[model samples]
Target: GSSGSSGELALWSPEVKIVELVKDCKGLGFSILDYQDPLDPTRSVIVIRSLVADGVAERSGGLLPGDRLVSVNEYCLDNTSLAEAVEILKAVPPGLVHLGICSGPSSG
Candidate 1:
């Protein structure tokens, strides 16, 4: 046997969708953390940490705890530092914020 203890290694790609929301609340109602890429320490993924109960993000029905915050207002966050992303998110004018996220469908 060339190799042993080998299980199925399937490759799966999920769809990333864009959603927009109108927020009159002071906050988006979610926390975020920069997950550093193990292969590339110079980059990080902006992941949603948590959603406040009945908050804007939670009530919007468009976000989840592990969803990747890929963009804000059509601005790509792939190359941004955590601090830069935070400022960009905070600098958005009140009203609609366009969010690009990558995650599987939410189950009820």
Candidate 2:
């Protein structure tokens, strides 16, 4: 749940879907493209920008870059902070973590 990125701007896209993901005690299966840099918004919320290939996220059978994350385990991300999102993700049970994604959201 710490920074391991260059703060690149991601295209926060589409409108919504439910993609399930799995995680581990660490790694948590994926990385988030934040919203604070020039090319993106500082307050657009969190988006899945990358995933560990064949890892928990990939193996879960859904998710992609540019997918708008709306909720985790039914807890909404509608007006939440990125930190909160990270907390939610990290806290989710490692197996079968449910996600409310957006737009059949893509960039796969």
Candidate 3:
């Protein structure tokens, strides 16, 4: 898992048990989004501005664009830049990070 804070990034190792839990959650219609920040390398924002119909995002609490992600489960993300955060997420496998999203008001 990964998180961004104060212009720095943090990465964590996901235990096998967590992976199993996520797998089960997926079975229950849960989905995990990719941790990527295109505009700001330090922040991992939601990919789309709106939620997709019937998608896990829509079913669960929708995540709007511009929401600043603080941590994943207990793992805090690196706040350096989007590319760096992505690199961290790429290094880890799925089910490692349970996202901790901080929704921001309109960008402007």
Candidate 4:
């Protein structure tokens, strides 16, 4: 994500709001997988897969074990880690995140 002043403030403020909303939603737990190797840190492996389940994933249009997360709201994954990606997802309200994803083949 762009860390310019406006972008930072936008992300930080909405992150706080999204945290509150996620708590309120009380949805199921799921992990977001990224292809990056955590130990290497500098590696730039693209995330060509993901693993999500429960209503959170289902309601978000069936993000599956192989669907690539190309970007989130115009923020390219780039060199970001799986954990970082997941944190971004967690920091956004489900509805907002859902708006970014294409309904996967398994969505139904």
Candidate 5:
């Protein structure tokens, strides 16, 4: 009954582009901050420029400043109470998890 990377999701898409990232609690000890997209308040994604050169998220160069963190180990994020999306990040077992990173919203 399971198919996604870690929990639910798999590929990606932005008008056309789709990709998948597999990793976790590893290199570049940086941190991630989430911001709700003003364009679509119902759906929120992770923002950058906030990565605290702190750790793994920093040393890991692939990650960009505006990359939208869309999934946790394949689980897609939704607007909920438990600081919802963040909990998915914190709940990870600290090993190798799949994270689906997408591009920022189209400039409108």
Candidate 6:
């Protein structure tokens, strides 16, 4: 018998709001920076570093700085490596791109 141990995470509970939006090819209107996870030390994680002043993501709201970037389009980035995340961003189509982020500043 074969057993698979993948797809077994659901840590996201209440207090965390997910935001999704579609952006064009012009830009992402924000900057994402990858850093060593404070909790895990060796694990790499991505965070919203900053947003373009008066840009679509800023002016429209929802996408805010400091939010942990959770997903892009349909791909999840919670545990994925930083370099892989960069590749995913580069590979995703520019039109109607989707984003899912953990919104808030409760804690780091």
What are the clashing pairs of model 5? 9-74, 27-56, 28-55, 28-56, 28-57, 29-55, 29-56, 30-55, 30-56, 30-57
Error of 1 at 49 (Å): 1.6
User: Over the full model, what C-alpha lDDT does candidate 2 score relative to the true structure?
Assistant: 0.65
User: Which candidate has the highest TM-score of all?
Assistant: 1
TM-score of each: 0.75, 0.65, 0.39, 0.44, 0.55, 0.67
Off by over 4 Å in 3: 1-59, 106-108
Error of 1 at 51 (Å): 1.1
lDDT of 5 by residue, 47-98 (tens): 4333555444544544556666655666666443337755766776665555
lDDT of 3 at 2: 68
1 against 6, candidate with superior TM-score? 1
Taken over the whole model, the C-alpha lDDT of each candidate is 0.70, 0.65, 0.41, 0.43, 0.51, 0.67
RMSD of each: 5.2, 9.5, 10.3, 11.3, 9.5, 6.7
Best by lDDT: 1
Candidate with the larger lDDT of 2 and 5:
2
- Residue pairs with colliding backbones in model 1 are none
Better of 4 and 5 by lDDT: 5
After superposing candidate 4 on the true structure, give the runs of residues whose Cα lies further than 4 Å from its correct spot. 1-24, 27-30, 36-53, 60-62, 98-108
lDDT of 1 at 17: 74
Give Cα distance to truth, residue 96, candidate 1, Å. Answer: 1.7
Worst 10 residues of 6 by lDDT: 7-16
Estimate, for each residue in 1-108, the C-alpha lDDT of model 6 and write its tens digit.
665464332233234454544566665677777866444676766777777887656765777777778788888887677688778877777756567776646343
TM-score of 1: 0.75
